[PDB]
Amino acid sequence: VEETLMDSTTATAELGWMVHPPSGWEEVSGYDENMNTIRTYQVCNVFESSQNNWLRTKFIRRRGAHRIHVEMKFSVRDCSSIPSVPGSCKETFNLYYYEADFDLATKTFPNWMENPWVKVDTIAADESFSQVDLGGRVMKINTEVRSFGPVSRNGFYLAFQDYGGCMSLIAVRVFYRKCPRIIQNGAIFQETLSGAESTSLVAARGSCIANAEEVDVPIKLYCNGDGEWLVPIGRCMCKAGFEAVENGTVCRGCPSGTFKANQGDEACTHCPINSRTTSEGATNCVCRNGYYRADLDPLDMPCTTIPSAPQAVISSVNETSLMLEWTPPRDSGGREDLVYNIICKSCGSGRGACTRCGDNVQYAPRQLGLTEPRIYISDLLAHTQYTFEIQAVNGVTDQSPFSPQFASVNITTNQAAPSAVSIMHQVSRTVDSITLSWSQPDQPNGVILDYELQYYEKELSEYNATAIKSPTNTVTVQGLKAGAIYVFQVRARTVAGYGRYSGKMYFQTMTEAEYQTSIKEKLPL
Ligand SMILES: *[C@@H]1O[C@H](CO)[C@@H](O[C@@H]2O[C@H](CO)[C@@H](O[C@@H]3O[C@H](CO)[C@@H](O)[C@H](O)[C@@H]3O)[C@H](O)[C@H]2NC(C)=O)[C@H](O)[C@H]1NC(C)=O
Ligand SMILES: *[C@@H]1O[C@H](CO)[C@@H](O[C@@H]2O[C@H](CO)[C@@H](O)[C@H](O)[C@H]2NC(C)=O)[C@H](O)[C@H]1NC(C)=O
Ligand SMILES: *[C@@H]1O[C@H](CO)[C@@H](O)[C@H](O)[C@H]1NC(C)=O
Ligand SMILES: *[C@@H]1O[C@H](CO)[C@@H](O)[C@H](O)[C@H]1NC(C)=O
């Protein structure tokens, strides 16, 4: 970024530059490269001998600059072109500067020689130029920049020296260079003026942007002479609850539905399932009411809840020993840390208040924290009634203000299994089904709850069998082959347990033709 301390082409009416001697430089109206009409200076005392012609600019405010740049546009007539020119002819001019705190210059001060002044360089027409048409004849306009520093006083003058040439100084622009305010690696680096030396790299310190915090230190950026910042050093990062936006220029609060817990430039991630943001810019998602997240739980994981009760409690009692199996709860709470607890309630044979179970009762594998849906129960009071409660508990249960969901079974020791079921008859049949029924076993020995039926193809074996559960003593079996003989065995279930499978009974589906006859009679639908 360049800041102009003086521009000769902004001259409204006339530049006030001092000419010494007046014999030399003269001010003349001219054109710029775009043919806009400006003020220029010229000197062509080529034949005259021993010429030292000086042109001094007005006072120029430094305005805090450190290295000053002077850009010069000009044209020179080549001494070859001038007929019968002496060897005094030159195609160069010299640039000088004088530093001062106040515009105290006269026609005699400072002295018009090299030393009160300071030489920048000898300027010549060298390969950097443009060509502009004027009225069919083209003019060559050279542009040359020079720089000088350090500069310390409030201002300075520039001086131009001719020593016997034909030249036209068209424009002079004086400027310094600054580096603009920038945001890099999360930091605001403020305006920095370029340094005095040509190769200067000036250092500036970064401060974190808005809702951001320093992460890697130190935070530094460097400004070069051409007005450009270099590669950054250090880093600021958007703090928790804030995400980097607008090519890293702002750190913005996390939008609703999103959270961020640790510092970073990354973007906020959505609240896990069954969680929500109380507000914007959230460091955490609050779990849904009745739902909790556990310690040691990944925070990407959804909020979870307690499991429901176990179901399908099936009990088989062998004398004082017992076996309880079941199937897992309908709702597992979203967790895989689900385990079962068994609580025992020894109770009177009648409606007397239940008592605590004995110390002697043995639980294999254990009373609590069961992994499989089954418990094998050892020594227990014989001919005694009891209630067993199997509760389901998962890894978030300890946060629940409610008691665990459980399943209950009332059962009595040394109770007899139902007798084997007598016989079964085929009620109806189709090509793919067999509907059949059987009699209640003659000696239930308790209340019967459900039945079990096992079927397999006669050509195949019990190895290939299937088993199903029947709430009543009649049921349909579907999916069978056409005209095939199937072997059926049935078993009853009381709280005490299962009976013995009945004798293998042999039924058969309709063949395809028999089913054709049946449906043909049934016509129409
Ligand atoms: C009904 O159940 C029986 C027994 O479970 C099944 O028979 C078994 O079928 C498998 C292939 O499905 C047989 O394994 C095969 O063994 C031969 C060598 O004999 C080998 O070349 C094959 O790559 C394959 O490993 C197995 O031997 C056989 N077992 C018996 C005792 O026969 C039968 O597939 C089941 N059918 C249905 C419809 O479910
Ligand atoms: C399992 O046994 C318990 C024994 O405590 C039974 O509990 C009683 O249930 C009746 C049901 O109306 C209540 O009126 C009683 O107050 C309960 N307490 C007692 C001490 O008897 C329970 O009903 C039995 N469950 C089944 C399905 O038989
Ligand atoms: C961010 O960078 C992309 C790069 O293609 C540019 O198109 C966009 O204008 C930049 N936005 C801002 C605010 O600088
Ligand atoms: C019950 O357990 C005994 C061992 O204590 C075992 O011999 C018997 O086969 C089991 N089953 C029945 C129905 O008794």
Numbering used by the authors: 19 to 543
How is this structure described in the published paper?
Eph receptors constitute the largest family of receptor tyrosine kinases (RTKs). In particular, EphB2 signaling regulates many developmental processes and adult tissue homeostasis. The Eph extracellular region or ectodomain (ECD) is a multidomain assembly, consisting of a ligand-binding domain (LBD), a cysteine-rich domain (CRD), and two fibronectin (FN) III domains (FN1 and FN2). Indeed, imaging studies with Eph-expressing cells have shown that, unlike the ‘canonical’ RTKs, where simply bringing two receptors close to each other is enough for signaling, the Eph receptors require the formation of higher-order assemblies or clusters, for full biological activity.
The protein was crystallized in 1.1 M Na Succinate, 0.1 M Na Acetate pH 4.8, 5% (v/v) MPD, and 3% 1, 6-Hexanediol, and the structure was determined by molecular replacement at 3.1 Å resolution with a final R-free of 25%. Overall, the protein shows an extended, elongated architecture (~150 Å long and 25–50 Å wide) with all four domains well ordered. As in previously published Eph–ECD structures, the region containing the LBD, the CRD, and FN1 is rigid, but the connection between FN1 and FN2 is flexible. The EphB2 protein is glycosylated at four sites: N265, N336, N428, and N482, as illustrated. As in some of the previously reported unliganded Eph ectodomain structures, the EphB2–ECD forms homotypic head-to-tail dimers via interactions between the LBD and the FNIII domains of two neighboring molecules. The size of the LBD–FN interface is 1103 Å2 and the specific interacting residues are listed in Figure 2B. For example, the FN C-terminal ‘tail’ (FN1-FN2) of one EphB2 molecule wraps around the LBD ‘head’ of the other molecule, covering several residues beyond the LBD and the FN2 domains. In EphB2, in addition to the 13 LBD and 10 FN2 residues, there are 12 residues within the CRD (including Ile-291, Asn-292, Arg-294, and Thr-295) and three residues within the FN1 (Arg-348, Arg-392, and Tyr-394) that participate in the head-to-tail interactions. Interestingly, the glycosylated Asn-482 in the FN2 domain is in the heart of the head-to-tail interface, revealing its important role in the homotypic Eph–Eph interactions. As illustrated on Figure 2A, the Asn-482-attached glycan wraps around the connection between the LBD and CRD of the interacting molecule, locking in place the LBD and CRD of one Eph molecule against the FN1–FN2 region of its neighbor.
